[PDB]
Ligand binder design. Structure first.
Ligand code: U68
Length: 295
């Protein structure tokens, strides 16, 4: 992998807190990290009320308004914001030549499961209400947001709502018990994501609910009828087998799944695309995948 990869890994390793951070710290820490990736001048951000869910359109000059990605940010269902993921959003908007709706969905522990799913489905329904065609739509998201993407599809389907053309999951989190093999074996090679912090955020999101609640942990959801699914995952991730198990399950349910394991990549490496080549390569692929399914 690139020298940029080894640099980011060592920097993350070196700056990892020596004790468990609070929700307040993680929130403000991610917000800070996020500000090191500045927003290019041609990016257009427009705040909007997505059917009672706050959000922002992210557009670049290339964008085709008729193509829309509903983007669901990661951060354990506990952290993240429009501002933490706007860079990733604009790269996708750029690569897929689309508009991206980045929503500030409700977060745990203030708003536990299923508040997140309530918001994502509402935002999706709002998109149809305002005239977006599912044939030119997609849902995408990273990690917790990658899990939320699957959950949202399942929920919409079960509600009889027309599903989008395609969907994309980046390092998705779908096992809230962390019993995948790579949680034990790949633990350490991932500078982020350890079991203990993971399960703590699971606890907050669940607020007592069964950790295999299907819409919370979509590894246990019924995936039949889902549209073409691109899953990008790094092979140095503790969440690798979240993607492996998701692909297995989705394909057994007749979903056209594409599992893309990027060698040596770390959790949501695409977030580092500003300086990580593979990050930008992966996003270019996202755009390619989406444009294929929109024609
Ligand atoms: C430099 O610009 C950025 C901007 C945002 C970032 C966001 C993330 C964050 C951790 C992210 O969205 O990924 C997740 C999502 C969910 C979890 N679980 O399961 O708790 C763990 C990581 C990481 C680097 C980032 C870098």
């Amino acid at each position: 992998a690139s020298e940029a990869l080894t640099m980011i890994v060592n920097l993350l390793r070196s700056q990892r807190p020596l004790q468990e951070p609070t929700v307040e710290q993680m929130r403000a820490g991610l917000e800070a990290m996020a500000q090191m990736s500045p927003l290019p001048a041609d990016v257009e951000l427009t705040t909007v009320d997505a059917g009672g869910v706050p959000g922002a359109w992210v557009r670049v000059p290339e964008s085709d308004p008729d193509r829309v990605v509903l983007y669901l940010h990661g951060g354990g269902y506990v952290i993240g914001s429009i501002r933490t993921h706007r860079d990733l959003a604009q790269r996708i908007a750029r690569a897929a030549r689309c508009r991206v709706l980045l929503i500030d969905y409700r977060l745990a522990p203030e708003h536990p499961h299923p508040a997140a799913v309530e918001d994502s489905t509402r935002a999706y329904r709002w998109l149809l209400e305002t005239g977006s065609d599912p044939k030119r739509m997609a849902i995408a998201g990273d990690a917790a947001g990658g899990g939320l993407t699957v959950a949202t599809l399942v929920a919409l389907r079960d509600a009889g709502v027309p599903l989008p053309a395609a969907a994309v999951c980046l390092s998705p989190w779908v096992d809230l018990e962390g019993i995948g093999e790579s949680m034990t074996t790949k633990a350490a090679v991932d500078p982020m994501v350890q079991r203990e912090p993971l399960l703590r955020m699971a606890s907050m999101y669940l607020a007592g609910q069964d950790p295999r609640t299907p819409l919370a942990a979509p590894l246990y959801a019924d995936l039949r009828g889902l549209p073409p699914l691109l899953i990008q995952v790094g092979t140095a991730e503790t969440l690798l087998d979240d993607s492996v198990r998701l692909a297995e399950r989705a394909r057994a349910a007749g979903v056209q799944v594409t599992l893309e394991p990027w060698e040596d990549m770390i959790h949501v490496w695409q977030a580092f695309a500003a300086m990580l080549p593979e990050g930008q390569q992966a996003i270019e692929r996202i755009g390619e995948f989406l444009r294929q399914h929109w024609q």
